[PDB]
Write a protein that binds this ligand. Sequence first.
Ligand SMILES: *C(=O)[C@H](CC(=O)O)NC(=O)[C@@H](CCCCNC(=O)c1ccc2cccc(O)c2n1)c1cccs1
Ligand SMILES: *C(=O)[C@H](CC(=O)O)NC(=O)[C@@H](CCCCNC(=O)c1ccc2cccc(O)c2n1)c1cccs1
Lengths: 88, 88, 173, 173
Amino acid sequence: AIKKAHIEKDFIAFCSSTPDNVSWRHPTMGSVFIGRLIEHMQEYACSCDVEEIFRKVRFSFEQPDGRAQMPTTERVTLTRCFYLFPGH
Amino acid sequence: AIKKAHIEKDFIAFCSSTPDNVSWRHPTMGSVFIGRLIEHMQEYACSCDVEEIFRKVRFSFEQPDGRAQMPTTERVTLTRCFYLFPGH
Amino acid sequence: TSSGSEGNVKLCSLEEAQRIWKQKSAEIYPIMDKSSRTRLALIICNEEFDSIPRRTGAEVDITGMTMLLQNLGYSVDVKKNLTASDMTTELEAFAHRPEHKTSDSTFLVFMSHGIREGICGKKHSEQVPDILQLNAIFNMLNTKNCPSLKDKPKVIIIQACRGDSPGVVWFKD
Amino acid sequence: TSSGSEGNVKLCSLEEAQRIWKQKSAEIYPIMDKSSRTRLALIICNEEFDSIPRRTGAEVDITGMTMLLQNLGYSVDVKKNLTASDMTTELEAFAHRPEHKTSDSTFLVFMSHGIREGICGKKHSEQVPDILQLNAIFNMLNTKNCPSLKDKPKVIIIQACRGDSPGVVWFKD
Ligand SMILES: *C(=O)[C@H](CC(=O)O)NC(=O)[C@@H](CCCCNC(=O)c1ccc2cccc(O)c2n1)c1cccs1
Ligand SMILES: *C(=O)[C@H](CC(=O)O)NC(=O)[C@@H](CCCCNC(=O)c1ccc2cccc(O)c2n1)c1cccs1
């Protein structure tokens, strides 16, 4: 038999900045959003779901400097918490 | 003195369905997304932050029927957890 | 009892408020003192339309949302049957409200017909579009155009279609 | 030690895995057995461009993301300097990969120049636009076009500008 499913579900997008705005990149150190995401992933994947981690990445950008940006979570259809359970 | 602030921050949007898709409404019972949001707010505002609550609303739509929809959280720039602390 | 100001909304006890203050550190949005704060909320609901079907049942949504946001401590503005331009005007007026200065947050509720591009005003037709874009709602409420709400949660709820599609695909077990 | 497959990523112990299984009920995404699962990830990074500035430092981002997603248990495809059409072709091929059937999730990473409308392909200019829209990424990976990933988390990371603006406004204390 056939069953219905939602056409769009279980998505989460994480963008480097808000709409209209630039995102920064160092020529030897790499992009700040990318480096920050890795750092938070390495630290928090064990204890936090990806949505929580993404919020924490955002919080790390809260205090603006000369090169400011605010990473944005977009089009979220996660119905459950996504834990990475690293090591498992 | 003058200080820099992020132009866009501390936003969360919650839409009734995914892009391209319809949302449902009963002529006497009202819109299902709206009724579901109130119910979850009443129940969970005491214990969960709004992002958590919104995910739970989404989860309640997980099993599709004849009138299916998937509420979507959009353009999130919340840097902290937003607790309503009802009664306070 | 639901006789109090919070109605059917389950209360957060002082013990619960401390546990949340403990389980997460300085990663919660500060709330202002209840005695002094002036929380504001705005509902824009379109039910009667010029060229598209009547949104029967919307009154139940208005009642529910109005009472809910009041229960959570917000003073609620309810605006009905507006064009996209009227919505913009009201949003602009809402962003200028002095109470936001002595508030810790806001809620914006839009309830209307909608298409892929955005929310339908009262005068909407396929021939003559009358649409408010989600992008513009954000612009009007950001730090540039609403400095009073800087660092404060702005929750936007939208009840609307985003196209014609049923949102479903088939699969076999 | 960072010598193992997870590298610098802090491990979740079995006790931690049980506490998470307890604090939240059936509201966690199921993970497949480590011995049998075939997790896939895709990085598309554009550094060399025809008509816009070179993205110097991108190689550091490629290295970091590749190693990270591997640490988390994903097999990583790395594609470089593609046009919007090439990105679409690769995405379509990625959605067709049989491993997704024996996987519990996926990660998609896009690293390029970008504008308000979307992500820049290698051949992008103001005269001749070459843009992949975020909307199309979702469409290609949804239940209709990627049934293998039904009910499974699809995480999309984008490093890109979304316009020319610095993202800042001034205020006084
Ligand atoms: C889209 O713009 C709007 C969203 C809104 O107005 O909030 N949605 C639609 O216009 C719907 C039509 C839904 C209203 C008419 N339907 C019913 O009277 C009805 C009958 C029976 C049931 C049974 C269960 C639950 C219900 O909600 C229900 N509703 C559209 C649907 C497809 C195209 S437009
Ligand atoms: C937008 O499309 C891209 C996003 C990307 O490629 O990931 N961003 C830009 O093109 C930036 C230019 C940033 C690269 C050049 N900047 C530097 O070399 C540089 C010098 C000094 C510092 C110091 C600290 C941190 C840095 O990241 C840094 N970078 C644009 C900026 C404005 C307009 S485009």
